[model samples]
Target: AQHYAQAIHHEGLARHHTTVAEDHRQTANLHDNRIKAAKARYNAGLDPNGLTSAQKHQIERDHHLSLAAQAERHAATHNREAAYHRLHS
Candidate 1:
């Protein structure tokens, strides 16, 4: 019974982490869209900021990608823990 409860807990954790990963991915996509828009504006000579804005967006996108990867790793760890508990139970 303890193992079963632990398995359920870990499964819940895994689900939460996966959700976090998805959120980060969505944020990264937002940054990607911003970067494209920035580039377009720069090319159109509408923004004298050059590629600086696009570079900033690129950095943000990379950061979110890193966060998403970390969340995925956490989710995988929780999934493994859940599986282990299930096996024991």
Candidate 2:
């Protein structure tokens, strides 16, 4: 009974961790897609809709790149942790 209970508990934890990993992965993909869109806009010489400043465009591009990078790192970390739980459990 004790071993069976432990297995069930760990199974639930594994599922939770897996869900977290998927969420992070989706977030990472979203950020990555945004980064690509920004690049496309830059190549097309798109305006800021209401403003015109090279500095502003550069700043926005840098922010998108940073966010995408951060999200990818987070997704990798979540996946690694989820893998750990799956392996141990």
Candidate 3:
């Protein structure tokens, strides 16, 4: 019974971590879309909020950094779940 409970607990924890990673993935998508829109506006010669090209480049670089972190989080979550399964099985 204790073992069963532990398994259930680990599964729940795995799901929670996966969900957290998904949220970060969603945020990364949002950043991607915003960057694309900004680029479009810049191309149109009507860049919004008077944002400079350098600022846009910085934002894009930040997005890359954000995506890397999100991917790491996702991998860590999956690795944890894998570890739990390996330990039990």
Candidate 4:
């Protein structure tokens, strides 16, 4: 129940996290795109790592969590919509 509720809270129009617009209100699956972009700048042997360690970590952590949150909400929305249809059917 906690996870379900959290999923809702994270993205369902300010459901949780003090209902803040935290995490950029992202989705469940966000690893690939954002991570890819950040790493791309580094793996190419970028000099001196223009991005600070803290900056990199925060962005990644916040983004991934947000994605997970958003994904949960997305599914929840679909489920509710589907149920609505079932009732009408």
Estimate the TM-score of every prediction: 0.96, 0.52, 0.58, 0.38
Q: Kindly list the per-residue Cα lDDT of model 2 for residues 1-89, writing each as its tens digit.
A: 45455555555655565556566556655655555666666667784432334444555555655565665556555555555555655
Off by over 4 Å in 3: 48-89
Ranking by lDDT: 1, 3, 2, 4
Model 3 accuracy (lDDT, Cα): 0.63
Which candidate has the top score in TM-score? 1
Q: What C-alpha lDDT values do all the predictions have?
A: 0.96, 0.55, 0.63, 0.51
lDDT of 3 by residue, 1-89 (tens): 45455666666666666666566666656666766677778778886553565466557657655765765676576567656665765
Candidate 1 segments exceeding 4 Å error: none
Error of 2 at 7 (Å): 0.6
Instruction: Indicate which candidate wins on lDDT.
Output: 1
The better candidate by lDDT, 1 or 3, is: 1
Clashing residue pairs in candidate 1 (N, C-alpha, C atoms within 3 angstroms)? none
Give candidate 2 misplaced runs (Cα > 4 Å): 47-89
